[PDB]
Ligand binder design. Structure first.
Ligand SMILES: Nc1nc2c(ncn2[C@@H]2O[C@H](COP(=O)(O)O)[C@@H](O)[C@H]2O)c(=O)[nH]1
Ligand SMILES: Nc1nc2c(ncn2[C@@H]2O[C@H](COP(=O)(O)O)[C@@H](O)[C@H]2O)c(=O)[nH]1
Ligand SMILES: [Mg+2]
Ligand SMILES: [Mg+2]
Ligand SMILES: [Mg+2]
Ligand SMILES: [Mg+2]
Ligand SMILES: [Mg+2]
Ligand SMILES: [Mg+2]
Ligand SMILES: [Mg+2]
Ligand SMILES: [Mg+2]
Ligand SMILES: [Mg+2]
Ligand SMILES: [Mg+2]
Ligand SMILES: [Mg+2]
Ligand SMILES: [Mg+2]
Ligand SMILES: [Mg+2]
Ligand SMILES: [Mg+2]
Ligand SMILES: [Mg+2]
Ligand SMILES: [Mg+2]
Ligand SMILES: [Mg+2]
Ligand SMILES: [Mg+2]
Ligand SMILES: [Mg+2]
Ligand SMILES: [Mg+2]
Ligand SMILES: [Mg+2]
Ligand SMILES: [Mg+2]
Ligand SMILES: [Mg+2]
Ligand SMILES: [Mg+2]
Ligand SMILES: [Mg+2]
Ligand SMILES: [Mg+2]
Ligand SMILES: [Mg+2]
Ligand SMILES: [Mg+2]
Ligand SMILES: [Mg+2]
Ligand SMILES: [Mg+2]
Ligand SMILES: [Mg+2]
Ligand SMILES: [Mg+2]
Ligand SMILES: [Mg+2]
Ligand SMILES: [Mg+2]
Ligand SMILES: [Mg+2]
Ligand SMILES: [Mg+2]
Ligand SMILES: [Mg+2]
Ligand SMILES: [Mg+2]
Ligand SMILES: [Mg+2]
Ligand SMILES: [Mg+2]
Ligand SMILES: [Mg+2]
Ligand SMILES: [Mg+2]
Ligand SMILES: [Mg+2]
Ligand SMILES: [Mg+2]
Ligand SMILES: [Mg+2]
Ligand SMILES: [Mg+2]
Ligand SMILES: [Mg+2]
Ligand SMILES: [Mg+2]
Ligand SMILES: [Mg+2]
Ligand SMILES: [Mg+2]
Ligand SMILES: [Mg+2]
Ligand SMILES: [Mg+2]
Ligand SMILES: [Mg+2]
Ligand SMILES: [Mg+2]
Ligand SMILES: [Mg+2]
Ligand SMILES: [Mg+2]
Ligand SMILES: [Mg+2]
Ligand SMILES: [Mg+2]
Ligand SMILES: [Mg+2]
Ligand SMILES: [Mg+2]
Ligand SMILES: [Mg+2]
Ligand SMILES: [Mg+2]
Ligand SMILES: [Mg+2]
Ligand SMILES: [Mg+2]
Ligand SMILES: [Mg+2]
Ligand SMILES: [Mg+2]
Ligand SMILES: [Mg+2]
Ligand SMILES: [Mg+2]
Ligand SMILES: [Mg+2]
Ligand SMILES: [Mg+2]
Ligand SMILES: [Mg+2]
Ligand SMILES: [Mg+2]
Ligand SMILES: [Mg+2]
Ligand SMILES: [Mg+2]
Ligand SMILES: [Mg+2]
Ligand SMILES: [Mg+2]
Ligand SMILES: [Mg+2]
Ligand SMILES: [Mg+2]
Ligand SMILES: [Mg+2]
Ligand SMILES: [Mg+2]
Ligand SMILES: [Mg+2]
Ligand SMILES: [Mg+2]
Ligand SMILES: [Mg+2]
Ligand SMILES: [Mg+2]
Ligand SMILES: [Mg+2]
Ligand SMILES: [Mg+2]
Ligand SMILES: [Mg+2]
Ligand SMILES: [Mg+2]
Ligand SMILES: [Mg+2]
Ligand SMILES: [Mg+2]
Ligand SMILES: [Mg+2]
Ligand SMILES: [Mg+2]
Ligand SMILES: [Mg+2]
Ligand SMILES: [Mg+2]
Ligand SMILES: [Mg+2]
Ligand SMILES: [Mg+2]
Ligand SMILES: [Mg+2]
Ligand SMILES: [Mg+2]
Ligand SMILES: [Mg+2]
Ligand SMILES: [Mg+2]
Ligand SMILES: [Mg+2]
Ligand SMILES: [Mg+2]
Ligand SMILES: [Mg+2]
Ligand SMILES: [Mg+2]
Ligand SMILES: [Mg+2]
Ligand SMILES: [Mg+2]
Ligand SMILES: [Mg+2]
Ligand SMILES: [Mg+2]
Ligand SMILES: [Mg+2]
Ligand SMILES: [Mg+2]
Ligand SMILES: [Mg+2]
Ligand SMILES: [Mg+2]
Ligand SMILES: [Mg+2]
Ligand SMILES: [Mg+2]
Ligand SMILES: [Mg+2]
Ligand SMILES: [Mg+2]
Ligand SMILES: [Mg+2]
Ligand SMILES: [Mg+2]
Ligand SMILES: [Mg+2]
Ligand SMILES: [Mg+2]
Ligand SMILES: [Mg+2]
Ligand SMILES: [Mg+2]
Ligand SMILES: [Mg+2]
Ligand SMILES: [Mg+2]
Ligand SMILES: [Mg+2]
Ligand SMILES: [Mg+2]
Ligand SMILES: [Mg+2]
Ligand SMILES: [Mg+2]
Ligand SMILES: [Mg+2]
Ligand SMILES: [Mg+2]
Ligand SMILES: [Mg+2]
Ligand SMILES: [Mg+2]
Ligand SMILES: [Mg+2]
Ligand SMILES: [Mg+2]
Ligand SMILES: [Mg+2]
Ligand SMILES: [Mg+2]
Ligand SMILES: [Mg+2]
Ligand SMILES: [Mg+2]
Ligand SMILES: [Mg+2]
Ligand SMILES: [Mg+2]
Ligand SMILES: [Mg+2]
Ligand SMILES: [Mg+2]
Ligand SMILES: [Mg+2]
Ligand SMILES: [Mg+2]
Ligand SMILES: [Mg+2]
Ligand SMILES: [Mg+2]
Ligand SMILES: [Mg+2]
Ligand SMILES: [Mg+2]
Ligand SMILES: [Mg+2]
Ligand SMILES: [Mg+2]
Ligand SMILES: [Mg+2]
Ligand SMILES: [Mg+2]
Lengths: 94, 38, 61
RNA sequence: GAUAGAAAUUUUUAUCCUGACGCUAUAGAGAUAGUACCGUAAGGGAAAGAUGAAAGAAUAAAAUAAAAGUAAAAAAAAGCAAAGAUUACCCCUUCUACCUUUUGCAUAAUGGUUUAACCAGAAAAAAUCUAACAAAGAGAACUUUAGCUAGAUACCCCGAAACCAGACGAGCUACCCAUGAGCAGUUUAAAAGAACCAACUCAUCUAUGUGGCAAAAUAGUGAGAAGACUUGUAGGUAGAGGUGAAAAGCCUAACGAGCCUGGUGAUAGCUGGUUGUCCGAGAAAGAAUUUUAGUUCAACCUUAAAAAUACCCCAAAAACCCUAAAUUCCAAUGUAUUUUUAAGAGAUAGUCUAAAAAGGUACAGCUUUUUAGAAACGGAUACAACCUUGACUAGAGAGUAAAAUCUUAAUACUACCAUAGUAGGCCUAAAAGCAGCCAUCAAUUGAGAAAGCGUUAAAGCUCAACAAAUUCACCAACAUAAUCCCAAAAACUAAUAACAAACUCCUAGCCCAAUACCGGACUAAUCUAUUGAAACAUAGAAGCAAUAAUGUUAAUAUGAGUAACAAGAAGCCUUUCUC
RNA sequence: GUUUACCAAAAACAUCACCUCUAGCAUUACUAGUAUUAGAGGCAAUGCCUGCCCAGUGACACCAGUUUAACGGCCGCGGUAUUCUGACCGUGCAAAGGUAGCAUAAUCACUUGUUCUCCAAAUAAGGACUUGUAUGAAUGGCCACACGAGGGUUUUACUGUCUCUUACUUCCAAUCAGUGAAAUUAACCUUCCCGUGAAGAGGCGGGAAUAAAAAAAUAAGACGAGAAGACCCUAUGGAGCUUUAAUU
RNA sequence: UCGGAGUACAAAAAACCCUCCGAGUGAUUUUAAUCUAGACAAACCAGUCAAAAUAACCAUAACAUCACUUAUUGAUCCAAAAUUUUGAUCAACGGAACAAGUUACCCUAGGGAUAACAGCGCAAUCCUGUUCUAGAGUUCCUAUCGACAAUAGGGUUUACGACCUCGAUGUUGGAUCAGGACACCCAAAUGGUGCAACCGCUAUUAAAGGUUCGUUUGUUCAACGAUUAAAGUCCUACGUGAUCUGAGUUCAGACCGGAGCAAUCCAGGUCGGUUUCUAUCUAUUAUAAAUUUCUCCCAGUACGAAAGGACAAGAGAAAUGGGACCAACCUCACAAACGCGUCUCAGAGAUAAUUAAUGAUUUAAUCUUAACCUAAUUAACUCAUAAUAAAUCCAGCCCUAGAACAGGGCACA
RNA sequence: AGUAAGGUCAGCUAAAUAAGCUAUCGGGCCCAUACCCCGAAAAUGUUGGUUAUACCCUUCCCGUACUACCA
RNA sequence: AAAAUG
């Protein structure tokens, strides 16, 4: 009898689906969590002028290690064992 | 797709509805009714 | 009426305007009498004058 | 432009060593055969075989009893027919068949009754990998500033209306040419392109029939019926044409131009299909274009290789009348990504939500631009886009996330009385608190030249003023559609409960989803060279894998034992009765 | 009389009659014919007739000039008699400015134009008025006898057409016996309501219903079957037809 | 095709058949060179700047300048030039060297990517109610209306969108059968009236039942005749063509008027023009318990100055519909069937709108989303009541019983 | 609703030297009118920007014509 | 040649 024109959650007339107490409590809990986050994000330990290049040798070393790992990309060695082990497929009993 | 300003009250997105419900005004309620409090 | 296929078959495009002449206060009295005399064939017995339009394809036209 | 393409000049040694990494009766010639059959003709053109040494061993013997279709053995509420299971077939719970096309398909968009056999990726210019030789390479002709040679990596199937050339068609039909034959009766001086009505020829109307008796019929009813009439035989006019009392008719059952063969495997930006497993990464559009049904680039993305900076980015900096969210450029820092080199294809036909705008109607599940997001197997009952969610496997472990009945349905204000200058002054027939204008004084403690009704003008009825008490007293309430309303229910046992995922821990691991396109590892079945000989291994090859093309052939099912078909009777047996 | 064999038999074509044009002539048509003839055409017997124009395009003339029974065209603006009209006038362009006749028609729309007859009632039919600014004279205009399975309207008679259907037979139909197809089919263990959804649900969601199988009927649905919509659009796809399209 | 402004508010880019300006060049002399770093922009082609160095003039600048200065322009090839240039509303402006109409005689490959019908979204348009009182109504907004305006609802018309279908969703009116909504035409119960009575005008509730016969038109509509208690508005694929009709629309033939030189064209009219299906599945294939008009009295009574003229109660007649039946008439050459013929058709509760009793909040009153019992009260809807309602004999033969299967009889005679 | 041509003295044709015939007024001819013979006045419907000139193009009001088709 | 009306 009661029809929702168009699709249920697109048109100009949508479903009047309301907000619930559980949803309100969930939003309040998330808001409290975020308030605690932004409180903890208020007072830094070191200042911007004190942190100027405090950790740079480690970053340079990490970048150098990445460069070395990338430059080490190269085909592996071919040994005599790889070629001579295929002969064993016909190893019989005398 | 509707305009920013419409006449049909522009039914709101669910998270904004939840935000409005959370931020609804809560009047201060005293412990004791002062009408026939002394 | 006329050839329009399914369009004329299932589209309401014939217009008819019918209104009473005696109580039509938006027309002058001598003009009303003159219309009642000259166009008596288009007026029925209840005093209602009828006009119809079929030529144009569009209802608004 | 697409494309076409030499020559001068060079090389080529006699014979045998020839058979098959070709097929085994849907394959290989169409072939058991150009035969049946279809066609007037040119022409098209198949399917069909399986015992054995002996069937001069048919009271005949042995291997499968494995497809679809049936019987043995019809079925018992409920549901894409299945899974979780379970003592138990159902009963309980959960999942909207599969490909194709789409923004999106269970869609009521397309395809398929089923089984069997056939049916669809093909090329080495540039490049990657491997190997030989290397300033040289190649078994002759060329290429070379690390190159030359060799090998492996690559690019489908079906489908038109059509155009041309050459045959075959006037035995049907259109019109002619020779030779013949028909029109009885009646009215009429008539064989009069007269009249009625037969044979005969056409086909007006209706009803049956519509896979029928019939690829044009039957019944009733109609027009002509001595003529521009029908009709038999023979012949002619042949397609850029013939013929036509023009219907663009007819020319052998489809004619705005016949049919067959050949070009022909015509061509299709258009539709349909495209056959084994697993793994990795993975794309929604800026510019041109007889172009928006497509191609070619750029931006993305895939497989390899070189490097070094790549995203977040504090200051400082980016216009002049006013201007928001905020953008560009860079330190530092948190991460590992980014840029070039060489191969490249797909895509360039898109939806919604939040935001900034425009058009429309401050209308759309509307259209056009910019930023962001999504397209769960959880939640919003069902659901594309909304929310929760870094998508592997096994468990009969656990903790969480979004999330489940949303708010009022409300408007009572009652007693107490009303006398005085005075009809305050002007116009008006009248203006006595009251069509109108100006003053708005003053008596009784207590009453406005009067705040609402009423009279033509009055009169009269109410308000505020005293005296009598003193709950609160401002606005706020608003119908409807069509098959049948729509989980049922519940105002108090303690709730920052509990129950709830592809999320996260736990126990083990083979240790993270996917369309187009791209890469890799394996592999089903054949043939060949070597192993092997109770059926395999390493290599080289392809006619190398079918749940799908209104796919071809053969057999089968449903519709269905349904629609539909027939023989007059008795009798002494072919003799008598009824039409 | 003929025609679309196979949805159209006609108001279409042809037709006697009337007009045009083209030809002075011999061995296969025309024609074994010779302008009173023979072809290419238009319109349709008969009766009244066929009014104006060579400005354009064709044809003769190879230029001028002739042709409309050739292709075809035959007017505006404004005021005026005494009110409606305009006998009339001024001015302009043309090749002429639509003559006779008929007229709401088979004739754009306004149209069911107005009026009379017919009916109790009529957008039907017939007769009249008539600018039809888009009628009109051999692409012929007007009437007339006979004619027509042509298209419309009446008067009786007639009747199941209908008020309102009924009864009886045959073929059908149902049962027994024999023979035995077709379109169609993804699989179905194949319900109803509301909502949802690619926007019309048997398969989803929320509820109701629910021993299982035959046989005979009705067709609301399975967006039923039949034909890769014939309407519309696209295709740098065709073909027919006509030319003042482009190469010839 | 190109440029400027807003959209695009602050680095760049950014679209629409979005809102406005323009450009396809003019005038003058300073006649404005060569070569080359480095950059802007950009898919490509193209477009832009430009440091240093050289040739000629001050021995100090040369970017030609102005008209919003930004646009004022065109690629190959080929032709003409003769040493170095030019040539196109190629304006469809990234440009084919040169090509028109019509097809309803049409054909083919596709599209629901794209229209006409239906469905669906929105409600511009349409239809409803309420809010607001200026005004009409002799005084008086609301008895009946009510302009300029407000709020909300429905999805019947047209328009808009282009989401489902173009390997088919068959398209108007009618014949048959109708299902449903109430925003009710009648029938029923009420309120207000500018309601004395009858006719009336509005307002509320009520959908079990009905809503006529004819002429013209294919007509839905519409005009007219006679009636009725009434000739209601809609949805249903503006219902229903596997039930029917084909008049029109919607093929091929042909006329008339007009357009086009022609082929052809027409929401411009006239004649004629094939309407297929054997039912697989879902669904379905009869219980009743009435309705409404017209006559006599009521009574020319109430009501009224008279003309006019009731309600209610009770008697009957009919008509429709449901269920049945042949004594007679009629159809009837069968004993049956059939109508035109005949018979029957109902009690209780319950309510919505609306009236009054009693009574507080609010010691008055007040029908009470205050209680208690209340009484007058519509249609529906249920229930009394009515029908079926005794299980296992069934070979054969009859039947007023029947498709088959079933069911009733076979002792009188 | 779109496209095409437009708006001239009081009336019609033109073209940008705004003219040519009617109409009007004042005379003459005539007995008086009319004809005829002289003289004068007579405007681009309006807004804007322009040119050597306007027949340039736009805004506001007027009559107009043709189209509105397949469904 | 021309040339109307009262
Ligand atoms: N252009 C483009 N098309 C896509 C992309 N992803 C999916 N599609 C298209 O989307 C359709 C399938 O939808 P999907 O399977 O992705 O939901 C196909 O037509 C496919 O080509 C994409 O990233 N880019
Ligand atoms: N005028 C011109 N004609 C060109 C050009 N390029 C090619 N053409 C062609 O050359 C031809 C010249 O012939 P025209 O038209 O002069 O008789 C045409 O077909 C034209 O299209 C060009 O650049 N200019
Ligand atoms: Mg919906
Ligand atoms: Mg909606
Ligand atoms: Mg938006
Ligand atoms: Mg008609
Ligand atoms: Mg027609
Ligand atoms: Mg038409
Ligand atoms: Mg419509
Ligand atoms: Mg070319
Ligand atoms: Mg063979
Ligand atoms: Mg088997
Ligand atoms: Mg189950
Ligand atoms: Mg495909
Ligand atoms: Mg689609
Ligand atoms: Mg796609
Ligand atoms: Mg669907
Ligand atoms: Mg399907
Ligand atoms: Mg399709
Ligand atoms: Mg398919
Ligand atoms: Mg199928
Ligand atoms: Mg190579
Ligand atoms: Mg060709
Ligand atoms: Mg012959
Ligand atoms: Mg013959
Ligand atoms: Mg005879
Ligand atoms: Mg005769
Ligand atoms: Mg017959
Ligand atoms: Mg008969
Ligand atoms: Mg006869
Ligand atoms: Mg005759
Ligand atoms: Mg040809
Ligand atoms: Mg021919
Ligand atoms: Mg013809
Ligand atoms: Mg024709
Ligand atoms: Mg044939
Ligand atoms: Mg092909
Ligand atoms: Mg294309
Ligand atoms: Mg992956
Ligand atoms: Mg994607
Ligand atoms: Mg900064
Ligand atoms: Mg940086
Ligand atoms: Mg590419
Ligand atoms: Mg594209
Ligand atoms: Mg959209
Ligand atoms: Mg985006
Ligand atoms: Mg779900
Ligand atoms: Mg995740
Ligand atoms: Mg006093
Ligand atoms: Mg008082
Ligand atoms: Mg109401
Ligand atoms: Mg859990
Ligand atoms: Mg683990
Ligand atoms: Mg995980
Ligand atoms: Mg191998
Ligand atoms: Mg194969
Ligand atoms: Mg197979
Ligand atoms: Mg197949
Ligand atoms: Mg069978
Ligand atoms: Mg059957
Ligand atoms: Mg039968
Ligand atoms: Mg027989
Ligand atoms: Mg003939
Ligand atoms: Mg014939
Ligand atoms: Mg025929
Ligand atoms: Mg005939
Ligand atoms: Mg016929
Ligand atoms: Mg004729
Ligand atoms: Mg004559
Ligand atoms: Mg004649
Ligand atoms: Mg003539
Ligand atoms: Mg001439
Ligand atoms: Mg001449
Ligand atoms: Mg006449
Ligand atoms: Mg006539
Ligand atoms: Mg006549
Ligand atoms: Mg007419
Ligand atoms: Mg008629
Ligand atoms: Mg009639
Ligand atoms: Mg008539
Ligand atoms: Mg007449
Ligand atoms: Mg004419
Ligand atoms: Mg004519
Ligand atoms: Mg002519
Ligand atoms: Mg003729
Ligand atoms: Mg005839
Ligand atoms: Mg006749
Ligand atoms: Mg005849
Ligand atoms: Mg009878
Ligand atoms: Mg049988
Ligand atoms: Mg089939
Ligand atoms: Mg079932
Ligand atoms: Mg779905
Ligand atoms: Mg669909
Ligand atoms: Mg539904
Ligand atoms: Mg269900
Ligand atoms: Mg359910
Ligand atoms: Mg329920
Ligand atoms: Mg049905
Ligand atoms: Mg289905
Ligand atoms: Mg169908
Ligand atoms: Mg198609
Ligand atoms: Mg069609
Ligand atoms: Mg067509
Ligand atoms: Mg194209
Ligand atoms: Mg072509
Ligand atoms: Mg071609
Ligand atoms: Mg030409
Ligand atoms: Mg750049
Ligand atoms: Mg310099
Ligand atoms: Mg172009
Ligand atoms: Mg272009
Ligand atoms: Mg460009
Ligand atoms: Mg025709
Ligand atoms: Mg087709
Ligand atoms: Mg669509
Ligand atoms: Mg699209
Ligand atoms: Mg439309
Ligand atoms: Mg529609
Ligand atoms: Mg639909
Ligand atoms: Mg709309
Ligand atoms: Mg609304
Ligand atoms: Mg008043
Ligand atoms: Mg769209
Ligand atoms: Mg369709
Ligand atoms: Mg289908
Ligand atoms: Mg279909
Ligand atoms: Mg259907
Ligand atoms: Mg009904
Ligand atoms: Mg009501
Ligand atoms: Mg009533
Ligand atoms: Mg009813
Ligand atoms: Mg329909
Ligand atoms: Mg409709
Ligand atoms: Mg509707
Ligand atoms: Mg219908
Ligand atoms: Mg119908
Ligand atoms: Mg039928
Ligand atoms: Mg039907
Ligand atoms: Mg018809
Ligand atoms: Mg005629
Ligand atoms: Mg027509
Ligand atoms: Mg007709
Ligand atoms: Mg006929
Ligand atoms: Mg059946
Ligand atoms: Mg049937
Ligand atoms: Mg009396
Ligand atoms: Mg009474
Ligand atoms: Mg009865
Ligand atoms: Mg009391
Ligand atoms: Mg009282
Ligand atoms: Mg009972
Ligand atoms: Mg029995
Ligand atoms: Mg005179």
């Amino acid at each position: 009898r009661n029809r929702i024109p168009g699709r249920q959650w697109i048109g100009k007339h949508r479903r009047p689906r309301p907000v619930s107490a559980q949803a309100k409590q969930n939003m309040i809990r998330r808001l409290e969590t975020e308030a605690e986050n932004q409180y903890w994000l208020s007072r830094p330990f070191l200042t911007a002028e004190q942190e100027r290049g405090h950790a740079a040798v480690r970053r340079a070393a990490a970048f150098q290690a990445l460069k070395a790992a990338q430059a080490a990309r190269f085909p592996a060695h071919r040994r005599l064992e790889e070629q001579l082990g295929h002969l064993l497929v016909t190893r019989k009993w005398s | 797709g509707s305009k920013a300003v419409t006449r049909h009250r522009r039914v709101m997105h669910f998270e904004r509805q939840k935000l409005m419900a959370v931020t609804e005004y809560i009047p201060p309620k005293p412990t004791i009714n002062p009408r026939c409090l002394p | 009426s006329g050839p329009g296929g399914q369009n004329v078959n299932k589209v309401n495009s014939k217009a008819e305007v019918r209104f009473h002449l005696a109580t039509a206060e938006w027309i002058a009295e001598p003009v009303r009498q003159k219309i009642a005399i000259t166009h008596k064939n288009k007026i029925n017995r209840l005093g209602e004058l009828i006009l119809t339009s079929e030529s144009s394809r569009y209802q608004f036209r």
